[PDB]
Design a protein around this ligand. Structure first.
Ligand SMILES: CCCCCCCCCCCCCCCCCC(=O)OC[C@H](CO[C@@H]1O[C@H](CO[C@H]2O[C@H](CO)[C@H](O)[C@H](O)[C@H]2O)[C@H](O)[C@H](O)[C@H]1O)OC(=O)CCCCCCCCCCCCCCCCC
Ligand code: CLA
Ligand code: CLA
Ligand code: CLA
Ligand code: CLA
Ligand code: CLA
Ligand SMILES: CCCCCCCCCCCCCCCC(=O)OC[C@H](COP(=O)(O)OC[C@@H](O)CO)OC(=O)CCCCCCCCCCCCCCC
Ligand SMILES: CCCCCCCCCCCCCCCC(=O)OC[C@H](COP(=O)(O)OC[C@@H](O)CO)OC(=O)CCCCCCCCCCCCCCC
Ligand SMILES: CC1=C(/C=C/C(C)=C/C=C/C(C)=C/C=C/C=C(C)/C=C/C=C(C)/C=C/C2=C(C)C[C@@H](O)CC2(C)C)C(C)(C)CCC1
Ligand SMILES: CC1=C(/C=C/C(C)=C/C=C/C(C)=C/C=C/C=C(C)/C=C/C=C(C)/C=C/C2=C(C)CCCC2(C)C)C(C)(C)CCC1
Ligand SMILES: CCCCCCCCCCCCO[C@@H]1O[C@H](CO)[C@@H](O[C@H]2O[C@H](CO)[C@@H](O)[C@H](O)[C@H]2O)[C@H](O)[C@H]1O
Ligand SMILES: CCCCCCCS[C@@H]1O[C@H](CO)[C@@H](O)[C@H](O)[C@H]1O
Ligand code: OEX
Ligand SMILES: [Ca+2]
Ligand SMILES: [Cl-]
Ligand SMILES: [Cl-]
Ligand SMILES: [Fe+2]
Ligand SMILES: [Mg+2]
Lengths: 56, 342, 36, 63, 56, 55, 35, 79, 505, 35, 33, 30, 37
């Protein structure tokens, strides 16, 4: 159902060519990116507190 | 340090405004050529001979509609080297044949390799664990699957994504109509990873900012932080209680939380890549056979899944003749699927 | 290295960007790409 | 550790753990074989790709 | 349009289907219908779900 | 979504590039248009009686 | 007497996370397997 | 690191002397590239009158891999 | 304790139990091979290599046996359709049994090595600590690989001591296993040239012998030893995963495009052959030649082998499947029985008409008939009220030449329309849709399934490479960074060279 | 249908009333600091 | 302070084509069919 | 069998929600 | 025979060798002019 809504929406509004939808994509692609980034930057920087065998 | 190699290494790793490193000898020229190829093509280069399209500022396109378009289907998967047997060193002809496409795709591919090497190299010199590089494998799997694997499984590069805003949208709609890509469970995990990543980003940044300790007098709280300070700038304890009571569960372990922030969107993009590898072969998740058998036999059976396939068949019929010009499709008006009136 | 104040350099560079971008919008309505 | 007949016979082959030739040793020669391997691959890729077209090499089933 | 699992849907094709176009924006609570039979035909559950959900 | 609710829609560059004679030179916007048209004419295939879909 | 042995662990949270992954995968992929 | 701050450089009179000439010379060079029509021939982009012949009903689409260069040439000759 | 995703790391310091795990893994892989073969033998119909070859039936390992010369069963048949043949021990069944026994032997060795893990051979003679000399193991193994590689090419493929390899004509009509002489000229690098495969094994095998002897005799430079962490078994995992994904991408590529090692009678035709109407062109040539030399149209088409016609049918194109459309191709369109013959369409003027073929991209496709110049002459309309080209209006009829329907002509519009819908798939065949309860929906072949799994596994093996490479080069920081890493080494301008303590200003 | 309507109206009024009187009952004071 | 640095080259590999391109695109705004 | 399977997996997830919440590993401020 | 595409292959190989050779020559030259302390 959600896909049906998306497709009819593209036909009737050309949502892809709408800059607010483009900001939305930038928002969710960027959100994913900075998530992967932040997660990875902090993780890469954990202080050594655990044995070579135990979870960090 | 000793020999020429070690002297060069010294120079490459100097602490300057833009780090270079060994990875830089790969990274910098390939990133720069991919980008300048894009700006050059979108600015000056046509797609008339490959697609029957205008695609540059020179021809009247705007930012949303310019592209460096794929080569003509008749080019197959040719590397399309400037000096190859197609262009034979003729730069103008090369541009006209789609040479900038493979130029940007291959330089971009080697640039991406270079960037990830730069992430391994910097992390090794700063003495951190290389998680950022590892996270970047997700962008790599996406670029490689979509820009290389996909068109390599298909008839030619023509069917790769063309480098442009509107061109990429066309790519989206082609995937809906032809592959029913929204139905595909590998794309769905992709969506979960991307929207879950964005959710995790919003929710973590908002949680930190709203359980900050008062470490200053300023009503603007940004100044009340010190990079070298020993202590947490926000209360994990309060954050944990808040989410536990709001949502029912909360993080308690900050290392878990951050690892999870790496895991979700990275795994997402990896899953979408696997589905796109599938689509290289038309190995789609297109249909549910049990729905088709019931629908074939029972003309009163209808679901959203049947409704969306009628949309797809509209997309194929209506876009193919201009979207696939080398097929010379002529579809007389009477054959076009259409509902009442429209 | 301090002669021309950074606020002027910013206001001027910022006005250049507006002008060149305003020009690009005008061209959307005139000549090639205007649909006319 | 258990000694066995067959372990005794093989012992020498697992005896030089950690042993290095000094400095760069044969690195320069390795790099020559590396560049040549790279060109090799480049040649076979471009043949398969019809970017490199040789006389009497018909890249097709049709031979 | 069939939305439910018992009427031939799977998790992917299944849905709670929007209320009838003949209703438009009219408020269609359960007591506005002559019967539950009618309510179900016209997509009354959709309005109930989305209104309580949005308030909630 | 809330502003396309009132039919202020995405950019339309359909037939925006024209040649010297007046031939339409398609762009990627026009190929988008061809796909949108497929969706339009098929959706709700029994619901329209008049030529324009106005809501 | 092999000195390399070490026990696997699984805390409660990890059990729940693992069960969620599995159940959710089953829920997502089951339609495609019934087809 | 080391390099002079950008702040210094772009507020310095010497910066503005050099670039009050180089910036406009490049810009004008960019302009001429188009105004002379030079851009069209370097890149092989059609001018508004060079997409189709006067009575041509079809697009000059490349359909040959190894003589596509020659096809464009042919397609170009009849305009 | 160890988190679940680290359980197998207990083997890192335990060469004996690593060899044991490797042995178990090898036992499972060989056990799979043998089991798979038997399941295939239990389900393979060998009665018709023309219209029911192995690739129509979901056979995955069967073609691999056939490719290197196992083509016969103990029960008397061979995959080229022979009867009475005696394969000796190495029938498909002999190969499956050999793999099962091997699996068993490997399993028992695994047991031994797991129990007697503490062998003095695995200890460093100086330290008493577990040690493996990886650079020299590499030389030994590479020497062995080269000798095997060389032998495979020199005796097996050439047929000097061995059966050769599967080869066929360019249309995959007469394939068989043959001795193959090496090709030493530039054409040996042509992927369609089988002599290239023989030369490859002979030449690359000599090169592996030589580099093998080199890696045994000459120690690694200290520079390389340290940079690649040659004392850490994880480095080998890392580069080995890399070579493995490279190789996996190559076998996806050559399965998809075709080569002398992916013959169409074993894996099915390629999608490109449909793309380029490769079989339709050859069928047309033969029909034109037949005619040029006197034949009637019935004779010319009656001369076309069913097997050639069958290739010219989209139901065999491996780009027509779906991810969840499981099983043999026969489960979709059905078990092919017979060519119906070549349909020729004509309008009421007697003008010959051609059905526009379905391209692989399309799940469904309209029925449009053009004249020989590509002009539309007839179609199956959707909206009827303004139809101009319907079969009814254009008086479309269809006549068949060759096959079951040879010499017949059909003029009933629904009937003519039915044949035209089949003609969008190319040549028309009669199928048995009942034996398997076939559903009428296309499935890919082994060529498609092989390509998919290998391209996917190759891509995931990239992540494996990155991961283990990273573990190798950053072993010192796996549990976190230095708890008191100097702020000077991470701040800016404190050091001349990033990371170098001795470059202090 | 009528009794249903009346029951629901009563339900909703009750909860709405709780919400209104609830926030009227010295809400600003219900915090951990300055009251 | 030096003048010709890596930073300097990096800045100009970008800024130089950029201004050249901006003049080119500005000129395009005055092209008519 | 198909509806049952969907509802069964769903019900297992809802139960898993209830335990994850009410019978979680309690967070310990130590 | 040196076919036109073989010749093109040799041209691309040389251009690549030239680009790489000059890139390293410049970097080495510069690395030696400007040593770290
Ligand atoms: C992980 C991340 C790592 C980091 C990123 C790295 C980025 C590096 C960039 C590398 C670029 C590789 C490009 C390969 C192009 C190609 O393939 O070009 C394709 C060519 C074959 O050419 C094609 O061949 C086809 C089939 O033709 C054959 O059949 C025809 C019809 O019967 C005719 O008979 C014809 O004569 C005969 O040749 C068609 O002719 C096509 O038009 C033609 O393009 O193969 C070839 O060059 C080589 C074929 C085998 C090698 C393939 C190895 C790599 C590719 C794996 C991709 C998987 C694809 C499977 C899909 C899933
Ligand atoms: C790190 C830098 C880098 C890398 C990895 C690449 C890589 C690529 N470039 Mg790009 N390029 C670069 C920098 C780079 N380029 C720079 C600085 C410029 C400006 C000059 C260009 C301008 C450019 C153009 C105009 C084109 C490319 C193209 C290509 C592609 C094919 C190249 C090829 O076949 O080489 C073959 C050569 C080699 C791989 C070098 C071999 C080196 C080995 C190790 C030594 C061998 C030397 C040899 C034995 C001695 C001479 C031989 C003699 C005995 C006969 C590939 C994606 C083509 C492309 O994109 O097509 C779509 C193309 O048309 N490049
Ligand atoms: C994103 C890509 C990527 C990244 C970030 C890494 C990262 C790593 N590699 Mg892995 N590798 C890769 C892809 C990658 N690799 C590929 C595709 C292969 C081939 C199978 C390898 C083969 C490999 C081996 C065998 C080893 C590594 C190792 C390593 C580690 C040290 C750095 C190194 O050796 O780089 C190597 C350099 C590169 C990947 C960049 C190569 C640049 C090429 C030469 C440019 C070529 C231009 C080309 C000729 C133009 C023609 C184009 C043509 C289409 C026309 C590190 C974990 C080592 C290790 O794990 O240490 C513990 C190790 O032993 N790599
Ligand atoms: C809720 C809606 C939604 C969401 C969240 C997604 C999310 C996703 N989609 Mg789906 N999509 C949707 C709806 C959605 N889609 C619908 C309705 C359709 C119609 C069927 C599609 C059709 C679609 C297609 C056809 C594809 C996707 C793909 C994807 C993935 C793209 C990941 C990515 O970031 O690639 C971005 C690209 C990269 C990350 C590659 C690396 C890029 C490098 C790092 C760029 C560096 C840039 C450099 C610095 C230069 C800057 C220059 C500047 C001037 C521009 C992601 C999982 C893709 C996919 O599955 O990939 C496997 C894909 O091909 N989607
Ligand atoms: C390279 C591996 C490989 C390949 C290419 C094939 C190919 C084939 N097999 Mg064999 N097979 C294999 C391995 C393989 N098999 C193994 C390991 C076994 C033992 C289980 C078998 C046992 C077997 C039997 C018993 C049969 C076949 C048959 C077939 C044929 C049909 C395939 C099919 O319908 O798949 C359909 C495949 C799918 C629907 C799976 C798609 C991918 C799934 C969804 C991945 C799951 C994703 C996961 C949830 C991701 C989670 C990660 C998380 C973090 C997100 C085909 C020739 C059939 C036949 O025709 O034989 C004569 C047949 O009866 N195979
Ligand atoms: C030759 C290939 C190879 C080998 C020998 C290893 C071995 C190892 N890996 Mg690597 N790895 C590989 C390829 C390989 N990996 C690939 C392709 C990937 C990307 C998918 C990875 C990604 C990876 C990660 C992210 C990690 C490892 C870790 C490890 C170590 C712990 C393994 C363990 O305890 O798992 C335990 C596994 C289980 C209890 C069950 C896993 C079940 C999987 C998901 C599905 C079941 C598989 C199926 C039944 C088998 C068929 C698959 C096959 C046909 C491909 C071990 C050294 C870990 C390590 O670094 O620890 C320090 C670790 O964190 N690996
Ligand atoms: C629109 C406003 C964007 C900011 C809202 C983000 C919400 C995220 C969730 C809460 C996250 C959260 O808790 O943030 C808290 C964060 C810091 O809190 P402080 O208490 O220190 O400062 C805010 C007040 O107390 C006044 O000092 O707030 C800000 O930084 C406000 C910045 C305003 C900047 C000026 C007004 C808006 C302009 C922002 C830029 C947008 C540009 C438009 C580009 C298209
Ligand atoms: C008014 C109340 C609103 C109630 C809403 C009910 C929400 C249910 C909450 C999720 C419970 C399941 C958690 C199990 C897992 C569990 O017990 O986690 C608890 C875990 C605790 O994290 P810690 O930091 O304490 O874990 C320590 C780690 O080091 C583990 O070793 O939380 C997370 O891991 C957060 C990230 C996962 C958050 C995932 C939420 C998933 C949403 C569900 C998506 C699928 C739905 C399918 C629809 C059919
Ligand atoms: C060492 C090492 C590695 C491995 C390295 C290996 C295995 C290297 C082996 C390299 C080999 C076999 C290289 C062979 C190259 C062959 C070449 C360059 C032949 C070129 C032939 C040409 C140009 C012929 C041209 C002509 C033709 C075609 C027709 C004639 O009419 C005219 C003529 C002669 C011009 C690893 C795996 C990468 C790991 C790290 C270290
Ligand atoms: C390809 C090629 C090459 C290369 C080239 C190059 C390298 C180039 C570069 C180029 C470039 C480098 C260019 C540049 C350009 C730029 C531009 C054109 C810009 C624009 C901008 C703008 C327009 C802005 C906008 C905006 C934004 C973004 C946001 C904010 C706001 C605004 C709106 C302002 C070579 C020769 C090697 C070879 C052959 C091929
Ligand atoms: C449909 C909407 C209803 C319309 C009604 C709105 C009109 C305004 C009426 C206000 C009169 C009630 O006034 C308000 O009510 C509640 C219950 O009596 C009081 O009683 C409360 O006092 C204190 C306030 O610190 C609370 O801690 C305590 O729990 C509670 O008993 C409020 O302190 C009083 O200020
Ligand atoms: C072009 C990059 C390849 C670098 C690897 C080869 C190092 S080679 C190494 O170089 C030394 C100087 O550092 C010389 O003194 C020595 O003779 C030589 O063996
Ligand atoms: O309903 Mn649902 O979709 Ca909004 O548009 Mn009109 O209406 Mn119906 O058609 Mn198109
Ligand atoms: Ca049946
Ligand atoms: Cl619809
Ligand atoms: Cl209407
Ligand atoms: Fe954080
Ligand atoms: Mg204009």
């Amino acid at each position: 159902g959600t896909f049906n809504f998306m497709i009819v929406f593209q036909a009737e509004h050309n949502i892809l060519m709408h800059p607010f939808h483009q900001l939305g994509v930038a928002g969710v692609f960027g959100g994913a990116l900075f998530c992967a980034m932040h997660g990875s930057l902090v993780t890469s920087s954990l202080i050594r507190e655990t044995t070579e065998t135990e979870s960090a | 340090e000793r020999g020429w190699f070690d002297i060069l290494d010294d120079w490459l790793k100097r602490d300057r405004f833009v780090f270079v490193g060994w990875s830089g000898i790969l990274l910098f020229p390939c990133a720069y050529l991919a980008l300048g190829g894009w700006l050059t093509g979108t600015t000056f280069v046509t797609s008339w001979y490959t697609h029957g399209l205008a695609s540059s500022y020179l021809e009247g396109c705007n930012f949303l509609t310019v592209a460096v378009s794929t080569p003509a289907n008749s080019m197959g998967h040719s590397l399309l080297l400037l000096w190859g047997p197609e262009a034979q060193g003729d730069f103008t002809r090369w541009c006209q044949l789609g040479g900038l496409w493979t130029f940007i795709a291959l330089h971009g591919a080697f640039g991406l390799i270079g960037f990830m090497l730069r992430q391994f190299e910097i992390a090794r010199l700063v003495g951190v664990r290389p998680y950022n590089a590892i996270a970047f494998s997700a962008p790599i799997a996406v670029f490689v699957s979509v820009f290389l694997i996909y068109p390599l499984g298909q008839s030619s590069w023509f069917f790769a994504p063309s480098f442009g805003v509107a061109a990429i949208f066309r790519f989206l709609l082609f995937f809906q109509g032809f592959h029913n890509w929204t139905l595909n469970p590998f794309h769905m995990m992709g969506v979960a990873g991307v929207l879950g990543g964005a959710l995790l980003c919003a929710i973590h940044g908002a949680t930190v900012e709203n359980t900050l300790f008062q470490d200053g007098e300023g009503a603007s709280t940004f100044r009340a932080f010190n990079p070298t300070q020993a202590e947490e700038t926000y209360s994990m304890v309060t954050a944990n209680r808040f989410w536990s009571q709001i949502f029912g569960i909360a993080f308690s372990n900050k290392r878990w939380l951050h690892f999870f922030m790496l895991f979700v969107p990275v795994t997402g993009l990896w899953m979408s890549a696997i589905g796109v590898v599938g689509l290289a072969l038309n190995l789609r998740s297109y249909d549910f056979i049990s729905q088709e058998i019931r629908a074939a036999e029972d003309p009163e059976f209808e679901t959203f899944y049947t409704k969306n396939l009628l949309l797809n068949e509209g997309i194929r019929a209506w876009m193919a003749p201009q979207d696939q010009p080398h097929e010379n499709f002529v579809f007389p008006e009477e054959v076009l699927p259409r509902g009442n009136a429209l | 290295g301090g002669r021309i104040p950074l606020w002027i350099v910013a206001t001027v560079a910022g006005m250049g960007v507006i002008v060149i971008v305003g020009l690009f919008f005008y061209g959307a309505y005139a000549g090639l790409g205007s649909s006319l | 550790a258990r000694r066995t007949w067959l372990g005794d016979i093989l012992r020498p082959l697992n005896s030089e753990y950690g042993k290095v030739a000094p400095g760069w040793g044969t690195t320069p020669l390795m790099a020559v074989f590396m560049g040549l391997f790279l060109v090799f691959l480049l040649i076979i890729l471009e043949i398969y790709n019809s970017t490199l077209i040789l006389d009497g090499v018909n890249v097709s089933w049709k031979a | 349009v069939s939305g439910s699992l018992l009427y031939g849907n799977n998790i992917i094709t299944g849905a709670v289907v929007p209320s009838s176009n003949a209703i438009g924006l009219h408020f269609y609570p359960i007591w506005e219908a002559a019967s539950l039979d009618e309510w179900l035909y016209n997509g009354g559950p959709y309005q109930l779900i989305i209104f309580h959900f949005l308030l909630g | 979504i809330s502003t396309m609710a009132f039919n202020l829609n995405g950019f339309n560059f359909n037939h925006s590039v024209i040649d010297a004679k007046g031939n339409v030179i398609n762009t990627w916007a026009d190929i988008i248009n061809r796909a949108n048209l497929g969706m339009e004419v098929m959706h709700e295939r029994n619901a329209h009686n008049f030529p324009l879909d106005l809501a | 007497p092999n000195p390399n042995r070490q026990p696997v662990e699984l805390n409660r949270t990890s059990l729940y996370l693992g069960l969620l992954l599995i159940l959710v995968l089953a829920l997502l992929f089951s339609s495609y397997f019934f087809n | 690191t080391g390099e002079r701050p950008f702040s210094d450089i772009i507020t310095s009179v010497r910066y503005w002397v050099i670039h009050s000439i180089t910036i406009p010379a490049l810009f004008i060079a960019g302009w001429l590239f188009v105004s002379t029509g030079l851009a069209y021939d370097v890149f092989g982009t059609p001018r508004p009158d060079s997409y189709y012949a006067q009575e041509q009903r079809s697009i000059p689409l490349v359909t040959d891999r190894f003589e596509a260069k020659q096809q464009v040439e042919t397609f170009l000759e009849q305009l | 304790g160890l988190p679940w995703y680290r359980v197998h790391t207990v083997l890192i310091n335990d060469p004996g139990r690593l060899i044991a795990a490797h042995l178990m893994h090898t036992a499972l892989v060989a056990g799979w091979a043998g089991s798979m073969a038997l399941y295939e033998l239990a389900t393979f119909d060998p009665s018709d290599p023309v219209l029911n070859p192995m690739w129509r039936q979901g056979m995955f390992v069967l073609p691999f046996m056939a490719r290197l010369g196992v083509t016969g069963s103990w029960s008397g048949w061979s995959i080229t359709g022979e009867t009475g043949i005696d394969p000796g021990f190495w029938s498909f069944e002999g190969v499956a049994l050999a793999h099962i026994v091997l699996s068993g032997l490997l399993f028992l060795a695994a047991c031994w090595h797991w129990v007697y893990w503490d062998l003095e051979l695995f200890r460093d003679p100086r330290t008493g600590e577990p040690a493996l000399d990886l650079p020299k193991m590499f030389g030994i193994h590479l020497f062995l690989a080269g000798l095997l590689c060389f032998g495979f090419g020199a005796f097996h493929l050439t047929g000097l001591f061995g059966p050769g390899m599967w080869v066929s004509d360019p249309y995959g009509l007469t394939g068989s296993v043959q001795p193959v002489a090496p090709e030493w000229g530039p054409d040996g690098f042509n992927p369609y040239n089988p002599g290239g495969v023989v030369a490859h094994h002979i030449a690359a095998g000599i090169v592996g012998i030589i580099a093998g002897l080199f890696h045994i005799l000459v120690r690694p430079p200290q520079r390389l030893y340290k940079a690649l962490r040659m004392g850490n078994i994880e480095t080998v995992l890392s580069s080995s995963i890399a070579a493995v994904f490279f190789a996996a991408f190559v076998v996806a590529g050559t399965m998809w495009y075709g080569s002398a090692t992916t013959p169409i009678e074993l894996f099915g035709p390629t999608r490109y052959q449909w793309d380029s109407s490769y079989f339709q062109q050859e069928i047309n040539r033969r029909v034109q030649a037949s005619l040029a030399s006197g034949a009637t149209l019935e004779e010319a088409w009656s001369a076309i082998p069913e097997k050639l016609a069958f290739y010219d049918y989209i139901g065999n194109n491996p780009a027509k499947g779906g991810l969840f459309r499981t099983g043999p191709m026969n489960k979709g369109d059905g078990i092919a029985q017979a060519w119906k013959g070549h349909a020729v369409f004509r309008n009421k003027e007697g003008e010959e008409l051609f059905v526009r073929r379905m391209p692989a991209f399309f799940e469904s496709f309209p029925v449009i008939l053009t004249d020989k110049n590509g002009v539309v002459k007839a179609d199956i309309p959707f909206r009827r009220a303004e139809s101009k080209y319907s079969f009814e209006q254009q008086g479309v009829t269809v006549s068949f030449y060759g096959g079951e329907l040879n010499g017949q002509t059909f003029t009933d519009p629904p009937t003519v329309k039915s044949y035209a819908r089949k003609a969008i798939f190319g040549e028309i065949f009669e199928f048995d849709t009942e034996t398997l309860n076939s559903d009428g929906i296309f499935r890919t072949s082994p060529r498609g399934w092989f390509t998919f799994a290998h391209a996917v596994f190759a891509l995931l093996f990239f992540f494996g490479h990155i991961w283990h490479g990273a573990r190798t080069l950053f072993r010192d920081v796996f549990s976190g960074i230095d708890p008191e890493l100097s702020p000077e080494q991470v701040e800016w301008g404190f050091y001349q060279k990033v990371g170098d303590v001795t470059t202090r200003r | 249908m009528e009794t249903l309507k009346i029951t629901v109206y009563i339900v909703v009024t009750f909860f709405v009333l709780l919400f209104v009187f609830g926030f009227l009952s010295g809400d600003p004071a219900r915090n951990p600091k300055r009251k | 302070y030096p003048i010709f640095t890596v930073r300097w080259v990096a800045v100009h590999t970008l800024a130089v084509p950029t201004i050249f391109f901006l003049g080119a695109i500005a000129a395009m705004q005055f092209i008519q069919r | 069998m198909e509806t049952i399977t969907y509802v069964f997996i769903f019900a297992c997830i809802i139960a898993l929600f209830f335990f994850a919440i009410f019978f979680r590993e309690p967070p310990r401020i130590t | 025979t040196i076919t036109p595409s073989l010749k093109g292959f040799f041209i691309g190989l040389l251009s690549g060798a030239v680009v790489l050779g000059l890139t390293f020559a410049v970097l080495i030259a510069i690395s030696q002019i400007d040593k770290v302390q």
